[PDB]
Amino acid sequence: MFNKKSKSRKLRGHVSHGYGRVGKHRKHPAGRGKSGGLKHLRSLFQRYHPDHFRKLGIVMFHRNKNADFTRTVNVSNLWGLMKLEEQMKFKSSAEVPVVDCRNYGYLKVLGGGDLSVKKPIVVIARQFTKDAEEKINAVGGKCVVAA
Amino acid sequence: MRGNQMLPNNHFNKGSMKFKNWFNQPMRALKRKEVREQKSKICYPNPLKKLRPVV
Amino acid sequence: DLIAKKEQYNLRMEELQKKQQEQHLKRVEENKKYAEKRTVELLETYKKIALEQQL
Amino acid sequence: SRQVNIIEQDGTSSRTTSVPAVFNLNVRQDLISFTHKNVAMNSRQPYAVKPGAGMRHSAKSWGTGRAMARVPRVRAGGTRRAGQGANANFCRGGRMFAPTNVNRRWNRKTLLSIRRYASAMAVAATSIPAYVEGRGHRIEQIENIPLVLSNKIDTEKTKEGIKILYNLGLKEELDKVEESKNIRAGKGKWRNRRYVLKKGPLFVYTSETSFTKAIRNIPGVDTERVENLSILDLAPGGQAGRLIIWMEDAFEKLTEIYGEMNEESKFKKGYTMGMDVAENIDVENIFYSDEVQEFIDIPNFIKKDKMVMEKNKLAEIQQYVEIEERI
Amino acid sequence: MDIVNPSLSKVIDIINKGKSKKQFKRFQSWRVKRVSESWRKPRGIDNRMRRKFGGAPDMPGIGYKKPNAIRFLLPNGYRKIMVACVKDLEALISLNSFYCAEIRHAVGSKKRIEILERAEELGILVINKEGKLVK
Amino acid sequence: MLKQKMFEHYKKKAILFDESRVPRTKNVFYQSLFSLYKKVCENTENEIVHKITKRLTMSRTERHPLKLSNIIEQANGKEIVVFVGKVLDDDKILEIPKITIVALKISKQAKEKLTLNGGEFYTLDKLFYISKDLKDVALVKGDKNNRKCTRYFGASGDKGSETYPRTRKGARRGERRIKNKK
RNA sequence: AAAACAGUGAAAUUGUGUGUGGACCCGAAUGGAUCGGGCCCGUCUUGAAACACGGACCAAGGAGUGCACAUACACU
C-alpha cells in the first residue's frame, strides 16, 4: 500500500515501548559501530562475514577506469541489436548485414547460444572467443578485428 | 550490531561538517535567464555565443 | 443484451428450486413407510434370537 | 465515433468536428489520487525553530544530597529566576524534543510515465456526465458536453463576456460560486488564508486572444494553456471531472499531444496510450453468457437443518421404546 | 413525548426493561480526584483487577455486546439521523419506517420553523420538536 | 476402505479456493475480473479454474514474469496456454510456432513478434470463448526463487554453503566465497 | 526575570442553606435495623499489603524524532 500508520502510535499507554522490563533500552549495550569483531562479536563474523580479517592481492597505486572499461555480448544476441523492422528485412533479403558492435558500446564477443538466423553475417569487434569465431565461420560469416 | 547486513561505513563522525540545501534553485535559474536577456540587447544583431572547434 | 439474459437465469433457477423441493418430499414419504415395516421385523428377530439361547 | 458542434458568439451552431482519441480511455481513481498527493507537496516552503533555542542560559545540576531532583538549574542571584530548572524538554523555557530542522525532505518524486498517464485519464473524465455531476458542478441547463467555443470571438469587455457565458447555460454554476464566499474556520484565518470559494469552470486556449482578459474577473473562472495543463487544475482535491470550456484550436491539439490508440505521441516522446487488464467494470455479467452456462453444473438447493438436542424436540425425531429381551 | 414505532409497539417495553445499566468506571477513580472516570485498562504487575481476584470490579469485553437487531435503537423504537437543512429530510423519504430525525443544536429559530413545516407534510418524526421554539 | 476415503478428501480440499482471501489492489478493473472467477468457482470442481482464482490473490512478487521462449518450452505441445502474469520479449529468438496466449499483460515488443509469426493475445476475461471444455489448455507458472537477491539468503560461514556474502566491491576490494565446494 | 484584552471565568480550597452517612469500592435489597465479597497504587524482583523505595492536593507543560547508506516486505 502507498500509506500505512506506524507502530509507535499503537504503543501509547504500554510501559516499556516494546523493549522489555528486565532488559530495558539502554544507550549502547554492545559497543559502537562494527567493533568487537575478533572478541565478543566473533560469532557474527564467522557466520556471515568469514573473509573480513585478511590482506590479499596485487597492488597498483593508481588505476584508470576509462582504460579498462568493457562490455560483452553473446553470439545469440547479435541479431537483436538491430531494430525489429530491420531484422524482418534482412531475414528474407538477398543481402548480408554488416554489424559493428562498437556502435552500441560493445567491445568483446562471447560464444553463448546459437545464431538467430542461419545466413551469413559480418561482425566487427575488438576481440572474439575461440567458440565465437567457429560459430560465425560455420554459417559462412566473417569476423573482423578493429580498434 | 545484529543480523546480516553489508558492514556499515557511514561517515558522519565529524562535528564540524557543513550541510548545503538547494531552496534557492528556482530563483537563481530566473536570475540567469534575466542576465542573458539584457546582455543580448547590448549587442543586439550579434549572437551571444562564439564559434568553437570540433575535437 | 446481457441484462436481459440475467432474467432468463433467475426464471430458470426458480423452476429448478420448486422442482427439487417436490422431489425431496417424496423421498421423505417413501422412507417413512420402509422404516415402519423394518422396525416390526427387527423387534421380532430379537425375540427369536433370545429363544435360540434358552434352547 | 461522434461529431461535436462549435458555438459562435450569438449562440448559433453550424460547423462540426470529430472528437479526439484520448476521450475513449478508461479511468483509474487510484492513480489520480496518488499523483495528486505527491505533486501537491512540491509547492511547500521550509519551516524550523531557531538553531539553539532553549539553550541560552548558564545552568548546572546541584547533584544529590539537597532534597531536590537532579535537573540542571539556572545560576543567578537577585531575581526569582535563581534555582529554576533550565535546559530539558520537561522545563518551562527549556529546549523542545528533537527540534524541527531545515534538512527535512520537503518535495516528492513521481515517475514521468505515471504523470503523463494520470493527466490523460483526467482529461477523459471531463466528458463523462456522471463524473462532472459527482464533483458538484451543476449542468442541468447545458445542452451537451463537451463545450467548444469558436474562434472569431471579438470580445474585449467583461460586460459582453458574461452575456456569452450565460448563453451557454452557465448561469446557475456561476451564481453557485458568487454566493459561496465565507471566512475560514480556525487559525488559518490569521495566516493569509482568510476567504474560501467553490471551484468553477476552467477555460483552455492554446492561442493568444482578447477573451482571456474579458472573462478573468468573473468569480470562479480559471485559465490555463493546453500544452502545460496541470493535475492540480484538472482534479482539485484529488477528485476528477472538472467542467472545461475548450477553444476550437485547443480541442484539435489534443490529437498531437496524446496521439492515437496504440501509437506513439510525437509531442510526448516515449509515451503511448495503453490497455487495462479488463475492458469494463461490468465483466461480472459474463457469467450469464451461453458459453459459461454450458460449462458449469446444476446446483443443489436442499440443505440440512441445524442439530437439536433438547429433550422434547429430540423425542419427536427419535421415539424410543423399551424391550424385555436380555440377549 | 409518548410516541412509539408501530412495528415494535407490543414489544418495546420488554426491550427497554432488558437493557443493562452497568458502568465501567476506571480503577481508583474513587480514591483521587486527578483520575477521571473514563475507562483505561490496568497494566500493573501487581494489580488486583487485571488479575481478576474475586471482589474486584468487572472489566469490559465482547461478551457484553447487545444483539445486532436491538443495537442502536432509541427507547421509542427508532434509529436516529442528524439534519441541518430542508434538503436533508429528502433523504429519509424511503426510510421513515425505522429512522427518525434530530435537528442539530446550532440551527437557529427562524430556520427550525422551515424544517418542521416540511417534516409535517413528508410524514417524518422529529424528536427535538419542542426544542428552543417553545416560547 | 476408510483410510483411502479420508485421503481422497484431503487431496480435494487442498485444491479448492479458500473464499476468505481477497486481492489488495484498489484497481477496480482488477477487482472486477476476480469477482467473475469467484462466482464461477462456487459452481464447479474443475481444477484449472480453482488454480487461476488462487493466483489472482497472490502478491506482485508471487506473480513473477516469463519470457516468450520459456512459455513455448513449458507449453508441452498444447495450443492454448494460460498465465496469471506479464509476458516479455526474448531478444535471442525470432521465429516461433503459432500459439494462443491468454494472460494478464504483454509488453509492446513481445506483442509485435507474436503477431508477425501468427498468433493471438487475449485477456483472461475471454478464456471461456477460446476453449469449450478446458481440455486443450496448459497452465504455466514462474518462480520467485530466480530473483538475484536469492543469492544472498543463508550463511556463508556454513560448510558446503553456496551463498554469497554481502560486500563492498571494487577492482581489488571484495569478500570471496571460501567454504563452498569446487 | 515577571507582566496581553478594564472579555469568558474550570479545578484544588472556604462560608451559608438543604439532604444523606461515620474511610471507601463491587454485588443485592428494606418502612426499618443491613447481609455477602474486597489489604495501597506504581516499580525492580524466584517472591510485595509489607517493618523495600516514589507519591499532601488541583491545573497546565512533559519522553522512539529528522537525514544518509545498504536491506526484506506490500503497493505502482
Automatic annotation (TrEMBL), chain C:
The keyword Methyltransferase does not apply. It comes from the Eukaryota. Residues 1-38 form a coiled coil. The keyword Metal-binding applies. GO terms for cellular component: cytosolic large ribosomal subunit. GO terms for biological process: maturation of LSU-rRNA from tricistronic rRNA transcript (SSU-rRNA, 5.8S rRNA, LSU-rRNA). Keywords: Coiled coil, Metal-binding, Ribonucleoprotein, Ribosomal protein. GO terms for molecular function: RNA binding; structural constituent of ribosome. Belongs to the universal ribosomal protein uL30 family. This is 60S ribosomal protein L7. It comes from Spraguea lophii (strain 42_110). The chain holds residues 5 to 59 of 235 of the full protein.
TrEMBL record, chain D:
Keywords: Ribonucleoprotein, Ribosomal protein. Gene3D superfamilies: 3.40.1370.10. GO terms for biological process: translation. It comes from the Eukaryota. One of its GO terms (cellular component) is ribosome. Pfam families: Ribosomal_L4. GO terms for molecular function: structural constituent of ribosome. PANTHER family: 60S RIBOSOMAL PROTEIN L4. Belongs to the universal ribosomal protein uL4 family. This is Large ribosomal subunit protein uL4. It comes from Spraguea lophii (strain 42_110) (Microsporidian parasite).
UniProtKB/TrEMBL annotation, chain E:
The keyword Ribosomal protein applies. The keyword Ribonucleoprotein applies. GO terms for molecular function: structural constituent of ribosome. SUPFAM superfamilies: Ribosomal protein L32e. It comes from the Eukaryota. Pfam families: Ribosomal_L32e (PF01655). Keywords: Ribonucleoprotein, Ribosomal protein. One of its GO terms (biological process) is translation. InterPro entries: Ribosomal_eL32, Ribosomal_eL32_arc, Ribosomal_eL32_CS, Ribosomal_eL32_sf. GO terms for cellular component: cytosolic large ribosomal subunit. Belongs to the eukaryotic ribosomal protein eL32 family. This is Large ribosomal subunit protein eL32.
UniProtKB/TrEMBL annotation, chain F:
Residues 166-182 have a biased composition (Basic residues). It comes from Spraguea lophii (strain 42_110). It holds the Pfam family Ribosomal_L18. SUPFAM superfamilies: Ribosomal proteins L15p and L18e. Residues 154-182 are annotated as: Disordered. The keyword Acyltransferase does not apply. One of its GO terms (cellular component) is cytosolic large ribosomal subunit. This is 60S ribosomal protein L18. The lineage of its organism: Eukaryota, Fungi, Fungi incertae sedis, Microsporidia, Spragueidae. Belongs to the eukaryotic ribosomal protein eL18 family. One of its GO terms (molecular function) is RNA binding.
